[PDB]
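Run: sequence + C-1027 aromatized chromophore -> complex structure.
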Amino acid sequence: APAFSVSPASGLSDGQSVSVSVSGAAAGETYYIAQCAPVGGQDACNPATATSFTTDASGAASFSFVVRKSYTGSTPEGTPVGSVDCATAACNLGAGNSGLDLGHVALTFG
Ligand SMILES: C=C1Oc2cc(OC)cc(C(=O)O[C@H]3COC(=O)C[C@H]([NH3+])c4cc(O)c(c(Cl)c4)O[C@@H]4c5ccc3cc5C3=CC=C[C@@]34O[C@@H]3OC(C)(C)[C@@H](N(C)C)[C@@H](O)[C@H]3O)c2NC1=O
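>> structure
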């Protein structure tokens, strides 16, 4: 598995933007990055922050991604699951695409 880390990862805030950076990947591929949050049963991701970033010549990447304490969850397949709120709940950003999974960083608004 390649590497994937974010600057901060706790006591975050809505609108707060962190500088993420992935490595070990390979130039010639694009991965989707977005915040998500499971719900003791299914999985709801953010359909708003769904951007696709490609790696560089050395298969490395690094950019600024904003976050949102609260956000309506919704499986990436195409179905509404409900609303989510990290104000007092648990959340975790995930990256990767259909072929190469990057990593999963847990966040914590507070
Ligand atoms: C147009 C988009 O619209 C949405 C809507 C949404 O609902 C809120 C959530 C996400 C999102 O960001 O989902 C994220 C949600 O993040 C996670 O799910 C984190 C989890 N750690 C994870 C889940 C997962 O399925 C996966 C990986 Cl690498 C990681 O594989 C690939 C993967 C990684 C991340 C995501 C989804 C997948 C796919 C689903 C099935 C296989 C995957 O492979 C993905 O399968 C599809 C079918 C999703 C595909 N499709 C053409 C987009 C493309 O994204 C492909 O990389 C997006 N992204 C979009 O591109």
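>> summary
The CA atoms of residues 31 and 98 lie 8 Å apart. The pocket of C-1027 aromatized chromophore is lined by residues 32, 34, 36, 45-47, 50, 74, 76, 94, 96-98, 101, 104 (CB under 6 Å).
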